Design a protein around this motif. Structure first.
Motif, PDB file in Angstrom:
ATOM      1  N   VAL A  14      -2.137   9.930   5.768  1.00 55.09           N
ATOM      2  CA  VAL A  14      -1.046   9.757   4.904  1.00 55.09           C
ATOM      3  C   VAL A  14      -1.477   8.823   3.884  1.00 55.09           C
ATOM      4  CG1 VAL A  14       1.446   9.004   4.555  1.00 55.09           C
ATOM      5  CG2 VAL A  14       0.627   9.994   6.713  1.00 55.09           C
ATOM      6  N   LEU A  15      -2.057   7.430   4.049  1.00 53.04           N
ATOM      7  CA  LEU A  15      -2.384   6.488   3.166  1.00 53.04           C
ATOM      8  C   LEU A  15      -3.732   7.017   1.959  1.00 53.04           C
ATOM      9  CD1 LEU A  15      -3.179   3.494   5.691  1.00 53.04           C
ATOM     10  CD2 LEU A  15      -0.930   3.829   4.000  1.00 53.04           C
ATOM     11  N   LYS A  16      -4.195   7.676   2.690  1.00 51.56           N
ATOM     12  CA  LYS A  16      -5.275   8.497   1.758  1.00 51.56           C
ATOM     13  C   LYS A  16      -4.657   9.337   0.668  1.00 51.56           C
ATOM     14  CE  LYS A  16      -8.845  12.331   1.289  1.00 51.56           C
ATOM     15  NZ  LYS A  16      -9.353  13.432   1.953  1.00 51.56           N
ATOM     16  N   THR A  43      -7.835   2.314  18.923  1.00 55.65           N
ATOM     17  CA  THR A  43      -6.883   1.516  17.712  1.00 55.65           C
ATOM     18  C   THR A  43      -7.249   2.246  16.100  1.00 55.65           C
ATOM     19  OG1 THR A  43      -6.147  -0.311  19.050  1.00 55.65           O
ATOM     20  CG2 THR A  43      -6.617  -0.754  16.741  1.00 55.65           C
ATOM     21  N   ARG A  44      -8.777   2.179  15.926  1.00 53.04           N
ATOM     22  CA  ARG A  44      -9.241   2.802  14.769  1.00 53.04           C
ATOM     23  C   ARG A  44      -9.281   4.185  14.576  1.00 53.04           C
ATOM     24  NH1 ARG A  44      -8.193  -0.190  10.620  1.00 53.04           N
ATOM     25  NH2 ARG A  44      -8.547   1.923  10.146  1.00 53.04           N
ATOM     26  N   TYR A  45      -9.905   4.898  15.318  1.00 52.06           N
ATOM     27  CA  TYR A  45      -9.950   6.346  15.149  1.00 52.06           C
ATOM     28  C   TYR A  45      -8.827   7.160  15.243  1.00 52.06           C
ATOM     29  CZ  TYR A  45     -15.219   5.499  15.582  1.00 52.06           C
ATOM     30  OH  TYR A  45     -16.183   4.779  15.313  1.00 52.06           O
ATOM     31  N   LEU A  46      -7.963   6.922  16.278  1.00 56.08           N
ATOM     32  CA  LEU A  46      -6.767   7.677  16.193  1.00 56.08           C
ATOM     33  C   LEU A  46      -5.659   7.306  14.937  1.00 56.08           C
ATOM     34  CD1 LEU A  46      -5.550   9.009  19.717  1.00 56.08           C
ATOM     35  CD2 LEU A  46      -7.389   9.650  18.260  1.00 56.08           C
ATOM     36  N   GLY A  47      -5.784   6.075  14.643  1.00 56.14           N
ATOM     37  CA  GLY A  47      -4.779   6.049  13.464  1.00 56.14           C
ATOM     38  C   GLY A  47      -5.478   6.614  12.002  1.00 56.14           C
ATOM     39  N   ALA A 103      -6.482  -5.586  19.313  1.00 56.97           N
ATOM     40  CA  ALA A 103      -6.954  -4.950  18.038  1.00 56.97           C
ATOM     41  C   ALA A 103      -5.916  -4.925  17.129  1.00 56.97           C
ATOM     42  CB  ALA A 103      -7.625  -3.636  18.802  1.00 56.97           C
ATOM     43  N   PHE A 104      -4.918  -4.555  17.449  1.00 53.72           N
ATOM     44  CA  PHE A 104      -3.780  -4.301  16.402  1.00 53.72           C
ATOM     45  C   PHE A 104      -3.593  -5.815  15.625  1.00 53.72           C
ATOM     46  CE2 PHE A 104      -1.429  -0.392  15.904  1.00 53.72           C
ATOM     47  CZ  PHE A 104      -1.830   0.531  16.889  1.00 53.72           C
ATOM     48  N   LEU A 105      -3.569  -6.891  16.357  1.00 57.39           N
ATOM     49  CA  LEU A 105      -3.371  -8.047  15.944  1.00 57.39           C
ATOM     50  C   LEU A 105      -4.465  -8.485  14.966  1.00 57.39           C
ATOM     51  CD1 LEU A 105      -1.634 -10.794  15.695  1.00 57.39           C
ATOM     52  CD2 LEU A 105      -2.686 -11.641  17.905  1.00 57.39           C
ATOM     53  N   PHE A 138       0.800  -1.113   0.039  1.00 64.45           N
ATOM     54  CA  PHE A 138      -0.031  -0.148   0.026  1.00 64.45           C
ATOM     55  C   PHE A 138       0.748   1.357   0.047  1.00 64.45           C
ATOM     56  CE2 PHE A 138      -2.982   3.179   0.471  1.00 64.45           C
ATOM     57  CZ  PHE A 138      -4.316   2.781   1.086  1.00 64.45           C
ATOM     58  N   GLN A 139       1.746   1.180   0.873  1.00 66.00           N
ATOM     59  CA  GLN A 139       2.560   2.476   1.193  1.00 66.00           C
ATOM     60  C   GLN A 139       3.415   2.762   0.104  1.00 66.00           C
ATOM     61  OE1 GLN A 139       4.662   3.590   4.956  1.00 66.00           O
ATOM     62  NE2 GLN A 139       4.463   1.229   5.002  1.00 66.00           N
ATOM     63  N   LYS A 140       3.837   1.830  -0.733  1.00 67.79           N
ATOM     64  CA  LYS A 140       4.723   1.828  -2.023  1.00 67.79           C
ATOM     65  C   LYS A 140       3.868   2.546  -3.222  1.00 67.79           C
ATOM     66  CE  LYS A 140       8.310  -1.637  -1.010  1.00 67.79           C
ATOM     67  NZ  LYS A 140       8.090  -2.978  -0.919  1.00 67.79           N
TER      68      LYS A 140
HETATM   69  C1  HEM Z   1       1.719   1.389   6.647  1.00 64.88           C
HETATM   70  C2  HEM Z   1       0.443   1.515   7.626  1.00 64.88           C
HETATM   71  C3  HEM Z   1       0.593   2.410   8.573  1.00 64.88           C
HETATM   72  C4  HEM Z   1       1.355   3.919   8.476  1.00 64.88           C
HETATM   73  C5  HEM Z   1       1.919   4.448   7.155  1.00 64.88           C
HETATM   74  C6  HEM Z   1       0.949   4.549   9.640  1.00 64.88           C
HETATM   75  C7  HEM Z   1       1.384   5.862  10.174  1.00 64.88           C
HETATM   76  C8  HEM Z   1       1.314   6.358  11.299  1.00 64.88           C
HETATM   77  C9  HEM Z   1       1.592   7.798  11.642  1.00 64.88           C
HETATM   78  C10 HEM Z   1       2.510   8.706  10.880  1.00 64.88           C
HETATM   79  C11 HEM Z   1       1.173   7.864  12.821  1.00 64.88           C
HETATM   80  C12 HEM Z   1       1.306   9.302  13.566  1.00 64.88           C
HETATM   81  C13 HEM Z   1       2.549   8.978  14.684  1.00 64.88           C
HETATM   82  C14 HEM Z   1       3.064   9.841  15.430  1.00 64.88           C
HETATM   83  O1  HEM Z   1       3.395  10.992  15.062  1.00 64.88           O
HETATM   84  O2  HEM Z   1       3.257   9.689  16.750  1.00 64.88           O
HETATM   85  C15 HEM Z   1       0.210   6.871  13.519  1.00 64.88           C
HETATM   86  C16 HEM Z   1      -0.132   6.618  14.585  1.00 64.88           C
HETATM   87  C17 HEM Z   1      -1.367   5.762  14.818  1.00 64.88           C
HETATM   88  N1  HEM Z   1      -1.557   4.600  14.135  1.00 64.88           N
HETATM   89 FE1  HEM Z   1      -0.542   4.015  12.111  1.00 64.88          FE
HETATM   90  N2  HEM Z   1       0.379   3.587  10.480  1.00 64.88           N
HETATM   91  C18 HEM Z   1       0.091   2.404   9.870  1.00 64.88           C
HETATM   92  C19 HEM Z   1      -0.502   1.244  10.125  1.00 64.88           C
HETATM   93  C20 HEM Z   1      -1.276   1.417  11.321  1.00 64.88           C
HETATM   94  C21 HEM Z   1      -2.227   0.288  11.603  1.00 64.88           C
HETATM   95  C22 HEM Z   1      -2.532  -1.115  10.926  1.00 64.88           C
HETATM   96  C23 HEM Z   1      -3.001   0.758  12.698  1.00 64.88           C
HETATM   97  C24 HEM Z   1      -4.049   0.105  13.559  1.00 64.88           C
HETATM   98  C25 HEM Z   1      -5.141  -0.809  13.197  1.00 64.88           C
HETATM   99  C26 HEM Z   1      -2.369   2.201  13.190  1.00 64.88           C
HETATM  100  C27 HEM Z   1      -3.065   2.686  14.239  1.00 64.88           C
HETATM  101  C28 HEM Z   1      -2.522   3.812  14.742  1.00 64.88           C
HETATM  102  C29 HEM Z   1      -2.868   4.336  16.004  1.00 64.88           C
HETATM  103  C30 HEM Z   1      -3.878   4.097  16.849  1.00 64.88           C
HETATM  104  C31 HEM Z   1      -2.071   5.592  16.096  1.00 64.88           C
HETATM  105  C32 HEM Z   1      -2.208   6.750  17.206  1.00 64.88           C
HETATM  106  C33 HEM Z   1      -0.980   6.509  18.088  1.00 64.88           C
HETATM  107  C34 HEM Z   1      -1.014   7.673  19.257  1.00 64.88           C
HETATM  108  O3  HEM Z   1      -0.989   8.741  18.796  1.00 64.88           O
HETATM  109  O4  HEM Z   1      -1.340   7.300  20.347  1.00 64.88           O
HETATM  110  N3  HEM Z   1      -1.578   2.316  12.145  1.00 64.88           N
HETATM  111  N4  HEM Z   1       0.295   5.761  12.381  1.00 64.88           N
END
Ligand code: HEM
Length: 212
Positions: A136-138, A125-129, A196-198, A27-29
């Motif tokens: 970024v993925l968008k 796990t869902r909303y904050l990501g 949830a991540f798993l 995806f990221q690529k």
């Molecule tokens: C390749 C895929 C992904 C990318 C490029 C990505 C990237 C990021 C980035 C850039 C942030 C902000 C990090 C920061 O500045 O501290 C973040 C936070 C977060 N991501 Fe992801 N992520 C990916 C996959 C996932 C998946 C699969 C999940 C969960 C299902 C996830 C859940 C979260 C959550 C919950 C946060 C918030 C962390 C916090 O602030 O407490 N991400 N991610």
């Protein structure tokens, strides 16, 4: 620690593993195709549906209520527009519902019905990501698949009721920090966020297998 800090620390290692699943590396690529994208989006449709159903069921429960932001955060209506875009007017007949999506949905119903004090793990796990890396993925999806800036097909990734994802995340963290929190609830919340991540990682590994 604060619950928002506990959760961030608890999931930082599994976030690294999730980001580096094959599906997410592809995806990221920019290697995401319409086929793979529709699989993952239809799967999110069932996951957010169950998550938001359980959020509705527990909206007045003090173990969740401070995180009740349907207008700002809820994704189901957006997912329904994306489903009509990607699968057409009969998307409800057409969308897949994979074993891994079923497993995730079943855990969401168990937490919502029997362990609502852990629901915050799943919303976190869902909303904050969604409000972070999901943005970024968008941009990657739009560029890979030629999606217009106007947003069709990517409603999921668009928050029209949030001016600033980052300020909103900060508000949400602050509210997570006002849940009544005993060491028991705190321990189990952080453990449920790892699960949830798993569940998401297992979804990715399954979609990837389905695609190759
Ligand atoms: C390749 C895929 C992904 C990318 C490029 C990505 C990237 C990021 C980035 C850039 C942030 C902000 C990090 C920061 O500045 O501290 C973040 C936070 C977060 N991501 Fe992801 N992520 C990916 C996959 C996932 C998946 C699969 C999940 C969960 C299902 C996830 C859940 C979260 C959550 C919950 C946060 C918030 C962390 C916090 O602030 O407490 N991400 N991610």
């Amino acid at each position: 620690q604060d619950l928002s800090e506990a959760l961030k620390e608890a999931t930082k290692e599994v976030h690294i593993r999730a980001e580096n699943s094959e599906f997410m590396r592809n995806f990221q690529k920019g290697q995401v195709s319409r086929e793979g994208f529709k699989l993952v989006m239809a799967s999110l449709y069932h996951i957010y549906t169950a998550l938001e159903e359980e959020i509705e069921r527990n909206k007045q429960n003090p173990v969740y209520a401070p995180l009740y932001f349907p207008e700002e955060l809820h994704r189901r209506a957006a997912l329904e527009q994306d489903m009509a875009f990607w699968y057409g007017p009969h998307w409800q007949e057409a969308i897949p519902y994979t074993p891994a999506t079923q497993h995730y949905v079943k855990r969401l119903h168990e937490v919502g019905g029997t362990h609502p004090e852990l629901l915050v793990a799943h919303a976190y796990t869902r909303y904050l990501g969604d409000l972070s890396g999901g943005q970024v993925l968008k941009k990657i999806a739009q560029k890979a698949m030629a999606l217009p800036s106007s947003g069709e097909g990517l409603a999921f990734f668009t928050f029209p009721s949030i001016d600033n994802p980052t300020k909103f995340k900060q508000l949400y963290r602050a509210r997570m920090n006002t849940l009544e929190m005993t060491p028991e609830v705190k321990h189990r919340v952080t453990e449920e966020a790892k699960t949830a991540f798993l569940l998401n990682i297992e979804l990715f590994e399954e979609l990837q297998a389905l695609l190759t």
